[PDB]
Design a protein around this ligand. Structure first.
Ligand SMILES: [K+]
Ligand SMILES: [K+]
Ligand SMILES: [K+]
Ligand SMILES: [K+]
Ligand SMILES: [K+]
Ligand SMILES: [K+]
Ligand SMILES: [K+]
Ligand SMILES: [K+]
Ligand SMILES: [Mg+2]
Ligand SMILES: [Mg+2]
Ligand SMILES: [Mg+2]
Ligand SMILES: [Mg+2]
Ligand SMILES: [Mg+2]
Ligand SMILES: [Mg+2]
Ligand SMILES: [Mg+2]
Ligand SMILES: [Mg+2]
Ligand SMILES: [Mg+2]
Ligand SMILES: [Mg+2]
Ligand SMILES: [Mg+2]
Ligand SMILES: [Mg+2]
Ligand SMILES: [Mg+2]
Ligand SMILES: [Mg+2]
Ligand SMILES: [Mg+2]
Lengths: 101, 99, 82, 114, 127, 151
RNA sequence: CGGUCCGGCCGGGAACUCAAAGGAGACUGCCAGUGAUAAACUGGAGGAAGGUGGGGAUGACGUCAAGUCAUCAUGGCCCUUACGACCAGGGCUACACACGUGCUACAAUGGCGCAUACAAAGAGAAGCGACCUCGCGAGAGCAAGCGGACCUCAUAAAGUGCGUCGUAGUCCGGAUUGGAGUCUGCAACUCGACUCCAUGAAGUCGGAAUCGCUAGUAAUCGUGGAUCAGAAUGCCACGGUG
């Protein structure tokens, strides 16, 4: 199980849309040569570090939604390979039948 | 003007009858109906491991086919638009209208 | 390597080093930040950088400016096989 | 024929023969012959001497032959005495750029001794 | 009138129109020698009009799509065959014996799971 | 091939001449499915034989082909743990195949510049009954008439 | 067919390719011969296809106390100021060696330079990102279009034509290392991918032995996708030559 891993993951998700995709302006914009070429850009580069170590979209492991498995993820369904198979055979994923071409 | 209707579905019989329901209800208000045209179907494939552990060559291959139909209406009287916006089809069809 | 658009150094290390060059050299400055560029500002001070279990002290000469701190604290122990 | 590059390249096309000069590859050789106004399907034969030292001090504009070797080796000595990570790998004989060392480091470690 | 034929090979598709009484072979608004640089493709396209003989007795306007050189050449052959069969209706019997009428149905085989190719198997070793 | 006996597969003639034999030759010379390369090489070598040392341009090939074609072969047959080398007659098509293969493999292991002129020398000396394709034939024979008692 | 700026680009056409729904077609159905008046075998015709047309999915009763308590679920056992929980740094990338599976080579059926042909199948909104300008280049700036048979990824490579190299450890090979950079990312020391300049190991076809493949197959040449901020010689797919 390791429920605590799921807790870590959901905390990272929430805190990450908490800060970023809202305050990306500290790097996406102020780094521009047209924004600064001097102490302003340096002050922004150092300000980007006091935001928590989380809150980056680059720290989500993107686990399964039912069992929380790290590996074998499928972005289309949000499930691991095991769960998409066990649910596809039961007939719950629409339109997903066995392919043979 | 022209009004354009795009129909997407996961099976072809439901979307076939949905396109019917559209194109005769368009002729019911006496309108010219261009189509219906089958656009190419988009089939997305997936390949999964089927053991819980350590069995790399044992796999399953699934696919989802999306069927696409297009219909254009080129002589809309006012009783054609409402006459198309009142129509009841089962849940498998997604319609997108374009003015 | 990194972009020329700004070298990297942490905030806590930056403040610790400025206050240590104002206040005269001191204890081996204990740090964990192996990722920070060595600046001209601390030639002469002794920084004890973490290597996983210990803090290896390094005395910064002028040749070290531009390198990272972690380059001067090896993380793995190994001395022959047999 | 001798150049400022002290070596003596042999009688083949000039763009290839000037690469026997240590520190000059193919791009440098093309730049050399383009600044000298010399085509590069010309041999070291069939060439003037009032065309050879225009090459000689056209190539004198680069860091070349033994003076390059010194520049390289002291850049290695620097690391080897700095005590850095690249220095530890240079001073010992293991790959420096982060390659696998469990297997397949035979170019850096030489033929295998059991 | 136009006499028309459709021909297909591995992944190519060729449509062929033949007109009476002139010598133009034109494919994709190009000569035969401009299009097919390989004389084997040039030979394959002239095959059906060698038993069914001509000097310059019909001109043919061809277009092709898909595939490579051999696929397009074979598609054009098959299309010429079908077109001239619509033209005469009784050149069929000797074209059957030449093998020009059968649509070559060899398609490239799919790659299969666990295999490096359609049939090439990974190197096995006992231990 | 336990049960399913096989027929044959079609082969095109050659654009330039209209031969099946030489079309077999370029399939045996082709490597990696590069047919254009092999056609180029074989035309380049064969004209190089014809007007440098030679006849009407198809005859000059068959005269070198006949003098390397073997007439008898060795095939081995097991006892209970012994295998006799029994000499056997070679069938026509296998004769042409063996000749073409030996010519190609002798031409492959020479020391000259092109492949066309390597092929050229080998075919020229096969016309003169020397080289190493012809001696391949000579010693397959030698071994066949050494085991002449096991017919 | 008309017109044209010579591009299906406009009028226009619904023929053709194609798209995707429906339908037809192959059944030893037909004709000979053999066969136990058999079931079936050889051959022929017609036909796009002939004898299971090609490929796939489909894996009987059971075997190996085979594998997985680390996907999940679960009987019993064990921990409960720690075998639970949070954080920073490190490690999973170590290196005397041995083995398995791959990629690149040892060259002329080739290497390099210039010119020029012919694909299929896919993906895309915190996404794909054109045109133009700057940079030798990786890329940067500006910014259109696209939830897509429309826009982008994206100018396929082997191939063909011309020139050169002329059998060399080479104009083969591109490992290793030095310097200078780009981009993603809080952050590229340990430990990322890519670019430029320079460096140019081994390697000249591989012992005993051993593997795959019966036709669009083997061999070879490129393309795409999932995972994914970035990071394939792996995996899963696609066509070309053959
Ligand atoms: K050089
Ligand atoms: K390593
Ligand atoms: K349990
Ligand atoms: K680590
Ligand atoms: K590999
Ligand atoms: K290997
Ligand atoms: K070289
Ligand atoms: K990625
Ligand atoms: Mg990630
Ligand atoms: Mg690595
Ligand atoms: Mg293939
Ligand atoms: Mg495998
Ligand atoms: Mg029609
Ligand atoms: Mg069955
Ligand atoms: Mg067990
Ligand atoms: Mg076990
Ligand atoms: Mg366990
Ligand atoms: Mg940690
Ligand atoms: Mg590991
Ligand atoms: Mg050699
Ligand atoms: Mg078989
Ligand atoms: Mg290759
Ligand atoms: Mg690929």
């Amino acid at each position: 199980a390791k429920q605590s891993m799921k807790a870590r993951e959901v905390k990272r998700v929430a805190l990450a849309d908490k800060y970023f995709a809202k305050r990306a302006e500290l790097k996406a914009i102020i780094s521009d040569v047209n924004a600064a070429s001097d102490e302003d850009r340096w002050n922004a580069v150092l300000k980007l570090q006091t935001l928590p170590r989380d809150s980056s979209p680059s720290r989500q492991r993107n686990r399964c939604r039912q069992t929380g498995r790290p590996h074998g993820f499928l972005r289309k369904f949000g499930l691991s390979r095991i769960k998409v198979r066990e649910a596809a055979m039961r007939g719950e994923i629409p339109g997903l039948k066995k392919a043979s071409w | 003007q022209r009004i354009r209707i795009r129909l997407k579905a996961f099976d072809h019989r439901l979307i076939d009858q949905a396109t019917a329901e559209i194109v005769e209800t368009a002729k019911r208000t006496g309108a010219q109906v261009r189509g219906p045209i089958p656009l190419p179907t988009r089939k997305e494939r997936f390949t999964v491991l089927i053991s819980p552990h350590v069995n790399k060559d044992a796999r399953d291959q699934y696919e989802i086919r999306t069927h696409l139909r297009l219909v254009d209406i080129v002589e809309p009287t006012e009783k054609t638009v409402d006459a198309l916006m009142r129509l009841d089809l089962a849940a498998g069809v997604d319609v997108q209208i374009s003015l | 390597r990194s972009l020329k658009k700004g070298p990297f150094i942490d905030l806590h290390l930056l403040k610790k080093v400025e206050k240590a060059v104002e206040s005269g050299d001191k204890k081996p400055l204990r740090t964990w930040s192996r990722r920070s560029t060595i600046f001209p500002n601390m030639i002469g001070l002794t920084i004890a950088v973490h290597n996983g279990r210990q803090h290896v002290p390094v005395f910064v000469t002028d040749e070290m400016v531009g390198h990272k701190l972690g380059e001067f604290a090896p993380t793995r122990t190994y001395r022959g096989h047999a | 024929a001798r150049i400022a590059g002290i070596n003596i390249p042999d009688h083949k096309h000039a763009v290839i023969a000037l690469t026997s000069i240590y520190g000059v590859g193919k791009t440098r050789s093309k730049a050399i012959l383009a600044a000298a106004g010399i085509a590069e399907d010309v041999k070291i034969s069939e060439l003037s001497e009032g065309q050879i030292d225009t090459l000689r001090d056209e190539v004198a504009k680069f860091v070349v032959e033994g003076d390059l070797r010194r520049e390289i080796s002291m850049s290695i000595k620097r690391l080897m005495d700095l005590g850095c990570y690249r220095g530890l790998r240079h001073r010992r004989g293991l790959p420096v750029r982060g390659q696998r060392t469990k297997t397949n480091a035979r170019t850096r470690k030489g033929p295998r001794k059991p | 009138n136009q006499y028309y034929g459709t021909g297909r090979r591995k992944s190519s598709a060729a449509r062929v129109f033949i007109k009476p009484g002139n010598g133009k072979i034109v494919i994709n608004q190009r000569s035969l020698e401009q299009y097919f640089g390989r004389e084997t493709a040039r030979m394959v396209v002239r095959q059906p009009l060698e038993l069914v003989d001509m000097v310059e007795k019909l001109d043919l306007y061809i277009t092709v799509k898909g595939g490579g050189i051999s696929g397009q050449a074979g598609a054009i052959r098959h299309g010429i065959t079908r077109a001239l069969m619509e033209y005469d209706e009784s050149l069929r019997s000797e074209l059957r014996k030449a093998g020009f009428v059968t649509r070559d149905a060899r398609q490239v085989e799919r790659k299969k799971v666990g295999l490096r190719k359609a049939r090439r198997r990974p190197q096995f070793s006992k231990r | 091939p336990r049960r399913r006996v096989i027929g044959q597969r079609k082969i095109l003639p050659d654009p330039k001449f209209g031969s099946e034999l030489l079309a077999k030759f370029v399939n045996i010379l082709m490597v990696d499915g590069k047919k254009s390369t092999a056609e180029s090489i074989v035309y380049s070598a064969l004209e190089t034989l014809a007007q440098r040392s030679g006849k009407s341009e198809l005859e000059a090939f068959e005269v070198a082909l006949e003098n390397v074609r073997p007439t008898v072969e060795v095939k081995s047959r097991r006892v209970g743990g012994s295998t006799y080398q029994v000499p056997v007659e070679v069938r026509p098509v296998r004769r042409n195949a063996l000749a073409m293969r030996w010519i190609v493999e002798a031409a492959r292991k020479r020391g000259d510049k092109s492949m066309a002129l390597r092929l050229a020398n080998e075919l020229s000396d096969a016309a003169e009954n020397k080289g190493t394709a012809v001696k391949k034939r000579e010693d397959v024979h030698r071994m066949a008439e050494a085991n002449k008692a096991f017919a």
